[PDB]
């Protein structure tokens, strides 16, 4: 039994350490790794540490523990909402901009507190823990979870026991994501998590510095999946106590807030050394208290936060572009891009906005479509630097011809990207309307639908811009300057 798991993890480690098999076999590799992980999971006993009470049975201890250490505990209560899970609900009227939530640093779990814990000796030895603060947080969480007298037990006992990150998806739920951009990040997350589990399983067994860890006695795959999912769905970047650099931290109590659209209203107060949150909007008594997590895409929300946000105003897809080495004007284009601070090839973003492209992508596309004569004007003479300076400004085109070319290219490229999907937008909408699906299945289908809808809007916006600049060209309008 004990030698069997070591065999499987060794088999899992070589499998997940192997290089990518090419993109055409990435699904087969994913299923192969899934098969090994489930075999290990069926031979283990789930979470090493489980608690007798329900999740809500421990929230009063969280409040008492946070109150003794200087945190705000009045004006809100914990409620199990259907849509978002557990969250905060106001018990009094809270006005927008009111400072209603604060958490002193003493309560936080940080990379620094991980270094000072029982994990300290192993942390001082393992290059992965030293380089990856998020993984160190995950093991800090696991070691304190298995320590009954831990200072952070009131926080750990109120954490979720499961998440909706793709690590928890069924095979057929991930299968909805075939042919999308997002599935490659799902592949990487699964392979990384499996490789990390097998690596640290062997490290804990071979390193004498790990002999005092509770994980030396029990460390299951379920433990690791839970720990990394807890960190990825809740971790935060804060300044060190010195204020000279940044670190990663879990912030109890405040991280129970669920997400809505708006602005970030949570910041660190270094003078008083505590996290502070002001109300994003008015919250009447009985209304859920929301915060704005950040300007993340729905792909990021699904993969790293475990939920899909309808009406995400910051949604985007990726588009990879680069100047071809077979372009006769490669050297000139690469130099103009270098002088503008833009790489010759990169992954850009297409936004669900008008225009769908940033200033950096606009600048790239302009250089991408420049003639030799236009390139020389951005490389030579007393006006070249001024021309570089306006490259990302929609109000100052290189020429009407350059604009028509770049919007034609983007229209063609976004149209071609749409042709690489296994389903159409209308088919996805029919699936959502006519099938009865799990939460995780709809996250996947809405993800693949959102990718095509962003590309479809980008096609329409580029076609409209092509016609605008074509009109300027045929009317011989003076260039703005």
């Amino acid at each position: 039994s004990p030698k069997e798991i070591l065999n499987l993890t060794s088999e899992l480690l070589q499998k997940c350490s192997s290089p990518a098999p090419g993109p055409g076999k990435e699904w087969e590799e994913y299923v192969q790794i899934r098969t090994l992980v489930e075999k290990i999971r069926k031979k283990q006993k789930g979470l090493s540490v489980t608690f007798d009470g329900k999740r809500e049975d421990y929230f009063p201890d969280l409040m008492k523990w946070a109150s003794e250490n200087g945190a705000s505990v009045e004006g809100f209560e914990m409620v199990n909402f259907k849509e978002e899970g557990f969250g905060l609900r106001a018990t009094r009227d809270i006005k927008a901009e009111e400072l209603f939530l604060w958490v002193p640093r003493k309560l936080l779990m940080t990379v620094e507190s991980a270094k000072n814990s029982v994990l300290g000796p192993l942390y001082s030895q393992d290059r992965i823990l030293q380089a990856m603060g998020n993984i160190a947080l995950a093991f800090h969480l696991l070691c304190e979870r298995a320590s009954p007298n831990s200072f952070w037990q009131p926080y750990i006992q109120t954490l979720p026991s499961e998440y909706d990150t793709p690590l928890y998806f069924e095979e057929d739920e991930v299968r909805y994501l075939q042919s999308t951009q997002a599935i490659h990040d799902v592949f990487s997350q699964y392979k990384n998590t499996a490789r990390q589990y097998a690596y640290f399983y062997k490290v804990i067994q071979t390193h004498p510095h790990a002999n005092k860890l509770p994980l030396k006695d029990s460390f299951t795959y379920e433990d690791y999946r839970w720990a990394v999912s807890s960190v990825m769905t809740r971790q935060n970047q804060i300044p060190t106590e010195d204020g000279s650099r940044v670190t990663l931290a879990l912030i109890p109590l405040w991280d129970m807030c669920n997400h809505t659209n708006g602005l970030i209203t949570t910041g660190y107060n270094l003078e008083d050394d505590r996290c502070e949150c002001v109300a994003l909007q008015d919250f009447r008594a009985g209304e859920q208290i929301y915060i704005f997590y950040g300007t993340r895409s729905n792909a990021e929300f699904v993969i790293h936060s475990g939920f899909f946000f309808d009406n995400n105003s910051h949604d985007r897809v990726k588009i990879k572009l680069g100047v071809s080495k077979s372009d006769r004007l490669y050297a000139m284009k690469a130099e103009v891009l270098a002088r503008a601070g833009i790489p010759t090839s990169s992954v850009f973003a297409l936004h669900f906005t008008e225009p769908p492209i940033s200033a950096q992508l606009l600048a790239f596309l302009r250089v991408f479509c420049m003639t030799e004569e236009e390139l020389k004007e951005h490389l030579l003479g007393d006006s070249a630097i001024d021309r570089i300076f306006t490259l990302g400004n929609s109000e100052f085109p290189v020429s009407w011809d350059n604009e028509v070319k770049l919007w034609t290219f983007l229209e063609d490229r976004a149209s071609l990207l749409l042709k690489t999907y296994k389903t159409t937008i209308e088919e996805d909408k029919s699936v959502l309307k006519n099938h009865d699906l799990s939460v995780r299945a709809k996250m996947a289908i809405k993800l693949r639908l959102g990718e095509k809808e962003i590309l479809e809007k980008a096609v329409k916006s580029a076609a409209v811009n092509r016609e605008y600049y074509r009109q300027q060209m045929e009317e011989k309008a003076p260039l703005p300057k």
Binding site: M132, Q189, N236, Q237, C257, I264, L270, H304
Partner: peptide, 15 residues
């Protein structure tokens, strides 16, 4: 504005 804005669930690299 916010000197140290805190992003709930900020995305990190896992390898």
């Amino acid at each position: 504005t916010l000197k140290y804005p805190i992003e709930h669930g900020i995305v990190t690299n896992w390898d």
